[PDB]
Design an enzyme around this catalytic site. Structure first.
Site, PDB file in Angstrom:
ATOM      1  N   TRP A   1      41.374  42.444  42.348  1.00 52.07           N
ATOM      2  CA  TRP A   1      40.555  41.625  43.226  1.00 52.07           C
ATOM      3  C   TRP A   1      41.194  40.190  43.131  1.00 52.07           C
ATOM      4  CZ3 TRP A   1      39.162  44.205  38.380  1.00 52.07           C
ATOM      5  CH2 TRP A   1      39.436  43.613  37.280  1.00 52.07           C
TER       6      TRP A   1
ATOM      7  N   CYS B   1      52.752  38.889  37.654  1.00 52.99           N
ATOM      8  CA  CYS B   1      51.293  39.011  37.601  1.00 52.99           C
ATOM      9  C   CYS B   1      50.433  38.234  36.644  1.00 52.99           C
ATOM     10  CB  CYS B   1      51.046  40.639  37.478  1.00 52.99           C
ATOM     11  SG  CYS B   1      49.126  40.813  37.727  1.00 52.99           S
TER      12      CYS B   1
ATOM     13  N   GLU C   1      44.862  32.251  45.840  1.00 56.57           N
ATOM     14  CA  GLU C   1      45.548  33.183  46.811  1.00 56.57           C
ATOM     15  C   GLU C   1      44.910  32.796  48.516  1.00 56.57           C
ATOM     16  OE1 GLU C   1      46.803  37.381  44.988  1.00 56.57           O
ATOM     17  OE2 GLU C   1      44.941  36.509  44.013  1.00 56.57           O
TER      18      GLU C   1
ATOM     19  N   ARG D   1      47.430  40.461  34.391  1.00 53.92           N
ATOM     20  CA  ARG D   1      47.708  41.896  33.648  1.00 53.92           C
ATOM     21  C   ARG D   1      46.799  41.954  32.407  1.00 53.92           C
ATOM     22  NH1 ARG D   1      54.043  40.936  32.311  1.00 53.92           N
ATOM     23  NH2 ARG D   1      53.524  38.583  32.806  1.00 53.92           N
TER      24      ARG D   1
HETATM   25  C1  HEM Z   1      43.019  43.248  38.403  1.00 54.23           C
HETATM   26  C2  HEM Z   1      43.220  41.780  39.272  1.00 54.23           C
HETATM   27  C3  HEM Z   1      44.599  41.215  39.621  1.00 54.23           C
HETATM   28  C4  HEM Z   1      44.839  39.730  39.702  1.00 54.23           C
HETATM   29  C5  HEM Z   1      43.554  38.793  39.438  1.00 54.23           C
HETATM   30  C6  HEM Z   1      46.255  39.634  40.073  1.00 54.23           C
HETATM   31  C7  HEM Z   1      46.712  38.614  40.344  1.00 54.23           C
HETATM   32  C8  HEM Z   1      47.971  38.193  40.996  1.00 54.23           C
HETATM   33  C9  HEM Z   1      48.606  37.174  41.546  1.00 54.23           C
HETATM   34  C10 HEM Z   1      47.621  35.811  41.655  1.00 54.23           C
HETATM   35  C11 HEM Z   1      49.915  37.482  41.930  1.00 54.23           C
HETATM   36  C12 HEM Z   1      50.611  36.496  42.579  1.00 54.23           C
HETATM   37  C13 HEM Z   1      50.519  36.940  44.100  1.00 54.23           C
HETATM   38  C14 HEM Z   1      51.259  36.234  45.278  1.00 54.23           C
HETATM   39  O1  HEM Z   1      51.113  35.076  45.068  1.00 54.23           O
HETATM   40  O2  HEM Z   1      51.594  36.653  46.295  1.00 54.23           O
HETATM   41  C15 HEM Z   1      50.376  38.795  41.379  1.00 54.23           C
HETATM   42  C16 HEM Z   1      51.154  39.608  41.639  1.00 54.23           C
HETATM   43  C17 HEM Z   1      51.500  40.765  41.355  1.00 54.23           C
HETATM   44  N1  HEM Z   1      50.616  41.666  40.685  1.00 54.23           N
HETATM   45 FE1  HEM Z   1      48.557  41.385  40.133  1.00 54.23          FE
HETATM   46  N2  HEM Z   1      46.819  40.863  40.131  1.00 54.23           N
HETATM   47  C18 HEM Z   1      45.811  41.831  39.852  1.00 54.23           C
HETATM   48  C19 HEM Z   1      46.149  43.381  39.725  1.00 54.23           C
HETATM   49  C20 HEM Z   1      47.364  43.836  39.840  1.00 54.23           C
HETATM   50  C21 HEM Z   1      47.540  45.444  39.777  1.00 54.23           C
HETATM   51  C22 HEM Z   1      46.380  46.584  39.759  1.00 54.23           C
HETATM   52  C23 HEM Z   1      48.828  45.566  39.939  1.00 54.23           C
HETATM   53  C24 HEM Z   1      49.723  46.835  39.900  1.00 54.23           C
HETATM   54  C25 HEM Z   1      49.269  47.863  39.554  1.00 54.23           C
HETATM   55  C26 HEM Z   1      49.428  44.213  40.072  1.00 54.23           C
HETATM   56  C27 HEM Z   1      50.906  43.899  40.064  1.00 54.23           C
HETATM   57  C28 HEM Z   1      51.444  42.862  40.730  1.00 54.23           C
HETATM   58  C29 HEM Z   1      52.676  42.811  41.054  1.00 54.23           C
HETATM   59  C30 HEM Z   1      54.066  43.696  40.918  1.00 54.23           C
HETATM   60  C31 HEM Z   1      52.910  41.246  41.412  1.00 54.23           C
HETATM   61  C32 HEM Z   1      54.132  40.814  41.943  1.00 54.23           C
HETATM   62  C33 HEM Z   1      54.211  40.558  43.432  1.00 54.23           C
HETATM   63  C34 HEM Z   1      55.454  40.111  44.111  1.00 54.23           C
HETATM   64  O3  HEM Z   1      56.368  39.716  43.480  1.00 54.23           O
HETATM   65  O4  HEM Z   1      55.411  39.949  45.632  1.00 54.23           O
HETATM   66  N3  HEM Z   1      48.642  43.188  39.918  1.00 54.23           N
HETATM   67  N4  HEM Z   1      48.982  39.286  40.850  1.00 54.23           N
HETATM   68  C1  LIG Z   2      47.161  43.815  43.252  1.00 56.70           C
HETATM   69  C2  LIG Z   2      47.153  42.448  44.046  1.00 56.70           C
HETATM   70  C3  LIG Z   2      46.284  41.679  43.433  1.00 56.70           C
HETATM   71  C4  LIG Z   2      46.255  40.330  43.688  1.00 56.70           C
HETATM   72  N1  LIG Z   2      45.141  39.313  43.473  1.00 56.70           N
HETATM   73  N2  LIG Z   2      46.966  39.715  44.577  1.00 56.70           N
HETATM   74  C5  LIG Z   2      48.065  40.483  44.939  1.00 56.70           C
HETATM   75  C6  LIG Z   2      49.130  40.045  46.029  1.00 56.70           C
HETATM   76  C7  LIG Z   2      48.264  40.511  47.226  1.00 56.70           C
HETATM   77  C8  LIG Z   2      48.719  39.721  48.601  1.00 56.70           C
HETATM   78  C9  LIG Z   2      49.877  39.182  48.734  1.00 56.70           C
HETATM   79  C10 LIG Z   2      50.241  38.161  49.955  1.00 56.70           C
HETATM   80  C11 LIG Z   2      51.629  37.656  50.340  1.00 56.70           C
HETATM   81  C12 LIG Z   2      52.683  38.411  49.736  1.00 56.70           C
HETATM   82  N3  LIG Z   2      53.913  37.716  50.449  1.00 56.70           N
HETATM   83  C13 LIG Z   2      49.383  38.468  51.108  1.00 56.70           C
HETATM   84  C14 LIG Z   2      48.032  39.266  50.756  1.00 56.70           C
HETATM   85  F1  LIG Z   2      47.209  39.390  51.928  1.00 56.70           F
HETATM   86  C15 LIG Z   2      48.060  39.843  49.556  1.00 56.70           C
HETATM   87  F2  LIG Z   2      46.681  40.572  49.527  1.00 56.70           F
HETATM   88  C16 LIG Z   2      47.960  41.948  44.681  1.00 56.70           C
END
Ligand code: HEM
Ligand SMILES: Cc1cc(N)nc(CCc2cc(CCN)cc(F)c2F)c1
Ligand code: HEM
Ligand SMILES: Cc1cc(N)nc(CCc2cc(CCN)cc(F)c2F)c1
Ligand SMILES: Cc1cc(N)nc(CCc2cc(CCN)cc(F)c2F)c1
Ligand SMILES: C[C@H](O)[C@H](O)[C@H]1CNc2nc(N)[nH]c(=O)c2N1
Ligand SMILES: C[C@H](O)[C@H](O)[C@H]1CNc2nc(N)[nH]c(=O)c2N1
Ligand SMILES: [Zn+2]
Lengths: 409, 413
Positions: free
Chosen positions: B283, B111, B288, B114
Site C-alpha cells: 500500500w 524499503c 509517493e 519493512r
Molecule cells: C506494505 C506496504 C509497503 C510500503 C508502505 C512500502 C514503501 C516503500 C517506499 C515508499 C519505497 C520507495 C519507493 C520509491 O520511491 O520508488 C519502497 C521501495 C521498495 N520496497 Fe517497499 N513498501 C511496501 C511493501 C513492499 C513489499 C511487499 C515489498 C516486497 C515484497 C517491498 C519491497 C521494496 C523494494 C525492493 C523497494 C526498492 C525499490 C527500488 O529500488 O526501485 N515493499 N517501499
Molecule cells: C511494493 C511497493 C509499495 C510501495 N508503497 N511502493 C512501491 C514502489 C512503487 C512504484 C514506484 C514508481 C517509481 C519507480 N521508478 C512508480 C509507481 F507507480 C509505483 F507504484 C512498491
C-alpha cells in the site's frame, strides 16, 4: 576508469575523473556503505603531504614543474629538516583555504568558493589577540547586512600541547539553560557549552536568545571568556508577511553563520582554529534551528496559533506549519536587507556549480545526504542529481571538543 | 565487527553485527561513495557457482526454524547438492519459497515499509507456462491484494531462470500505471514517465484511448516467448478521486490515482536462483503520489495549477509557493484515500513505524540494512525521525535486484 553521474530530472550525464585524486577513507567498503554516518605527523608522513600540495598549487598557476616551483619544493623540504614543520607562503594559504571550501563535499554554497576573504592570524599568541582577529572578522563579514564570506586562520598545530582553539562551535550561538523542572531554556543544543561558560564565570541573562561569549584558547593555555561587542552581532526579528500574531512569538535569529570548531588541513599542516563564515540558507534557521525537536521546537507552538488539527499526523499539520515558519525567516531577512538564500535558489545555484566544476575541473565531490535540503527535498533540483562523494585535499575536517581533551592548569 | 549507528535526535546508539553476512557490491570503495547512485555496473550461474549459494541459503533457512544441523537439514543439503549436480539447478520446497520471499522484503534496504515483512501472502506461480496463464495469476493477485480497499501485501512468483533464453518477464514496471502520450508539439498527455512503454504497447496492437488516466495493458512474457497483451479488467483496478478537505475547487482539478502499488520489474534472488518475474504489492505512502507522482517536473507537474488556484504569490521562489502547494496536495491525497477507506500511510506514521522496526531488528536480528537516501521521504525530511538516524547499507541475500528492461534484451520472432 571513469565514472558517470546522471540527473534523472534532466537526463543530463556528467563524467567524473577528478575522483582519481582522493586518498583518505570514505569509510565505505564494497561490503558496507556509510554514506549516512556523520563521522566514520612524523618526519616521513609530513614531507609528501606538503609535496603534493605544492605540486597542486604550482599546477594551478600554469607554472607546473617551473624553475620557481622546484625552489619552493626545495625550500619547503629544507625547512622541514630544521623546524620539523614548515610555514605556508601567503599565496599558498589563500589557495589552500579557498580549495578546502571547494572540496567541502557537504557544502551547497560552493559556487562562491573562490570569493573567499582570507585573514592570516598566524602572528596571534594570546586569547586577547584571538578576540581581536575574531571581532575584525565578524565586523568585516557582517558588513551592515551585505554579508561577505571570510575565514580567519590562527597558528597551525605544532605538538598538540599548544593548540589554538575556539571552543564555541560557532562564533555566534544562543545560550542553553537547564530549567529546574527538566525542561530547557534557550537553545537546547548548547546546554553543555553554556554550563561551561557559566562554570567559567559567565553571568548569564537567562532568556532564550542570549548571545554566548567567546571562549578562546591560545597556545595550549586555559581558555578565556570574551563578550563580543553587541554592535557587531547583527540579528533579525522574525515576522510573517501574513500572520500578525507571528511577531508575537518573540522569535529572532542572528545573521552570521560562522563555523569555528573545525580543522583545516593544508599540505600536511593542521590549523585547529580557523573560524569561517558565509550567509544562511533559510532552511538552516526555519527547519533545523527552529523545528528540530532537540532544538527550539516551535512546531506545536506555530500550529496552535494557526489553529491546525494536531491529533492525526496525516493532517500534515507539522508540514503546514513548517512552510509558514520558513516563509517568515526568508521574509524577515529580506525586509531587513540581510543576505539570505532560500533552498530553491541555493540548490539551483549548486547545479550550476556542479556543471561548472565538471567542465573546468572534471568532478565535484558532493554528499547527497547533506546537499539535499531538509524540506521539500524532491522539488529541488539536487534531489534528482546523482553525486559522487570522495575526499580531496585541502579540506575541512572535524576534531574533538577541546573540553573532552584539555588538561588544565 | 561491532559497527555503531547513532540517532542524533534521541542519542540512541545501536550495534550492528548482521553486516558480517553481507555480499555483492555496495558500489562503494574506500575512495568513492556511491550511496546516491541509482544503480551499479546468457549470464547464468554454473554448477560451481550454485553449490555454495544454495548451501548458504539452506543453512540459513534451517537456522531460522531452529533445526540447524538436524537430519532434515542434512538430507535437504544432500538433496539440493545432487539436484544441482544432475540438472544444473534445483527447486525450492514451497516452505523455502515463502521464507525466501519474505526475507528478500526484510532485506530490501530501500524499503521504509519493512515492519510488515513477515505478513506477506506468497502465491506460488511456478507451474505457469504461458502468457495467458500469467495474466490469470496476476488478476488473482490484484484482486486478493486490493481486497476492496483493505490492501494486503502479496507477491506472485513465476518460474525461475534456466538458461536465460526462456525467462518469464512482466514487461510493465508496475502492474498498474497510466499511459503517457507525447504529442506533435512536445507536450505530453497523461504520465510522462510512461511514454516509452506506452509506445511499445501501442506498437503491439494496443488501441489507446488517449486520456490523462488510461490504465496500461499488461504485457506478459512466458518462457522466453514474445510478450502478449492483456487488458486488466477495469472492475479489478481500484482508483481514488483526489479531493481536498478545505479547497472545494480541488476536485475541479480532475485528479485521480489507482490504489494499488505493485512493482513488477525486479528480480527475486533466492539461494542463487533468479525469479525474473515476481510482482509484489503493498500500500502507498502518500508522498509517493502527492510529491513524486503529481509534483515532479517530469511527472504530472501540477504545482503551477494548484498554486494558481490557491492565489499564491509565485513571482519569487522565496515566497515558498511550491512548498506551500505541495503540502495541500499531499493533504488532499491522504484525505481522499482515507475518505474511501483505501489503505494508505502518511510519511510521518510510516517513518516512525520504520524506526520502531529498525530498533527491533537490531535487538532481535543484529542489524537492519537501510538506504538513507531512499528511506527519507522526499518532503519534510528533517521533521521525520529517519532523517536523524544513521543507517548502514549492505546487501543481504535473499534479495530483490534490478534487471535490464526486457525490450532492450529480448530477441524477437
Ligand atoms: C506494505 C506496504 C509497503 C510500503 C508502505 C512500502 C514503501 C516503500 C517506499 C515508499 C519505497 C520507495 C519507493 C520509491 O520511491 O520508488 C519502497 C521501495 C521498495 N520496497 Fe517497499 N513498501 C511496501 C511493501 C513492499 C513489499 C511487499 C515489498 C516486497 C515484497 C517491498 C519491497 C521494496 C523494494 C525492493 C523497494 C526498492 C525499490 C527500488 O529500488 O526501485 N515493499 N517501499
Ligand atoms: C511494493 C511497493 C509499495 C510501495 N508503497 N511502493 C512501491 C514502489 C512503487 C512504484 C514506484 C514508481 C517509481 C519507480 N521508478 C512508480 C509507481 F507507480 C509505483 F507504484 C512498491
Ligand atoms: C556563502 C554562503 C554559504 C552557504 C549558503 C552555505 C551553505 C551550507 C549549508 C546549508 C551547510 C549545511 C550546514 C548544516 O546543516 O549544519 C553547509 C556545510 C558546510 N559548509 Fe557551507 N555555505 C556557505 C559558505 C561556506 C564557506 C565560506 C565555507 C568555508 C570557507 C563553507 C564550508 C562548509 C563546510 C566545511 C560544511 C560542512 C559542515 C559540516 O560537516 O558540519 N561554507 N554549507
Ligand atoms: C559557513 C556556513 C554557512 C552556512 N550557511 N551554514 C553553516 C553551518 C552553520 C551552523 C550549523 C549549525 C548546526 C551544525 N550541526 C549551527 C549553527 F549555529 C550554525 F551557524 C556554515
Ligand atoms: C546495497 C545493495 C543492495 C542490494 N540489494 N543489491 C546490491 C547490488 C547492486 C545494487 C543494486 C541496486 C538495486 C537493488 N537495491 C542498487 C545498488 F545501489 C546496487 F549497488 C547492492
Ligand atoms: C539521484 C538520487 O539518488 C535519486 O533522486 C533518488 C533519491 N532518493 C529517492 N528516494 C526514494 N524514496 N525514491 C526515489 O525515487 C529516490 N530517488
Ligand atoms: C543521520 C544523518 O546523516 C544526519 O542527520 C544528517 C543528514 N543530513 C544532514 N544535512 C545537513 N545539511 N545537515 C545535517 O545536520 C544533516 N544531518
Ligand atoms: Zn558509500
Amino acid at each position: 576508469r571513469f565514472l558517470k553521474v546522471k540527473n534523472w530530472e534532466t537526463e543530463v550525464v556528467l563524467t567524473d575523473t577528478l575522483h582519481l585524486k582522493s586518498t583518505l577513507e570514505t569509510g565505505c567498503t564494497e561490503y558496507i556503505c556509510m554514506g549516512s554516518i556523520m563521522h566514520p605527523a612524523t618526519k616521513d608522513q609530513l614531507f609528501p603531504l606538503a609535496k603534493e600540495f605544492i605540486d597542486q598549487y604550482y599546477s594551478s598557476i600554469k607554472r607546473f614543474g617551473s624553475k620557481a616551483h622546484m625552489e619552493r619544493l626545495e625550500e619547503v623540504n629544507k625547512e622541514i629538516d630544521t623546524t620539523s614543520t614548515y610555514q605556508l607562503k601567503d599565496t599558498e594559504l589563500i589557495y589552500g583555504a579557498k580549495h578546502a571550501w571547494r572540496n567541502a563535499s557537504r557544502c551547497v554554497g560552493r559556487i562562491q568558493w573562490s570569493k573567499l576573504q582570507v585573514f592570516d592570524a598566524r602572528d596571534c599568541t594570546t586569547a586577547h589577540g584571538m578576540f581581536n582577529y575574531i571581532c575584525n572578522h565578524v565586523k568585516y563579514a557582517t558588513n551592515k547586512g551585505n554579508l561577505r564570506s571570510a575565514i580567519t586562520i590562527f597558528p597551525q598545530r605544532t605538538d598538540g600541547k599548544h593548540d589554538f582553539r575556539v571552543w564555541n562551535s560557532q562564533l555566534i550561538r544562543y545560550a542553553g539553560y537547564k530549567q529546574p523542572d527538566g525542561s530547557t531554556l534557550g537553545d537546547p543544543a548548547n546546554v553543555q557549552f553554556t554550563e561551561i561558560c557559566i562554570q567559567q564565570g559567565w553571568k548569564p541573562p537567562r532568556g532564550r536568545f542570549d548571545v554566548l561569549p567567546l571562549l578562546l584558547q591560545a597556545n595550549g593555555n586555559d581558555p578565556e571568556l570574551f563578550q563580543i561587542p553587541p554592535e557587531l552581532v547583527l540579528e533579525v526579528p522574525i515576522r510573517h508577511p501574513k500572520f500578525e500574531w507571528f511577531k508575537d512569538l518573540g522569535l529572532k535569529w542572528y545573521g552570521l553563520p560562522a563555523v569555528s570548531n573545525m580543522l583545516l588541513e593544508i599540505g600536511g599542516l593542521e590549523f585547529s582554529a580557523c573560524p569561517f563564515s558565509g550567509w544562511y540558507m533559510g532552511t538552516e534557521i526555519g527547519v533545523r534551528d527552529y523545528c528540530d525537536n532537540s532544538r527550539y521546537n516551535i512546531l506545536e507552538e506555530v500550529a496552535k496559533k494557526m489553529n491546525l488539527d494536531m491529533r492525526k499526523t496525516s493532517s500534515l499539520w507539522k508540514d503546514q506549519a513548517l512552510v509558514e515558519i520558513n516563509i517568515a525567516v526568508l521574509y524577515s531577512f529580506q525586509s531587513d536587507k540581510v543576505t539570505i538564500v532560500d533552498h530553491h535558489s541555493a540548490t539551483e545555484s549548486f547545479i550550476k556549480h556542479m556543471e561548472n566544476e565538471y567542465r573546468c575541473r572534471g568532478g565535484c565531490p558532493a554528499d547527497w545526504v547533506w546537499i539535499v535540503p531538509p524540506m521539500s527535498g524532491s522539488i529541488t533540483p539536487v534531489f534528482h542529481q546523482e553525486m559522487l562523494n570522495y575526499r580531496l585535499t585541502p579540506s575541512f575536517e572535524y576534531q574533538p571538543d577541546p573540553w573532552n581533551t584539555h588538561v588544565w592548569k
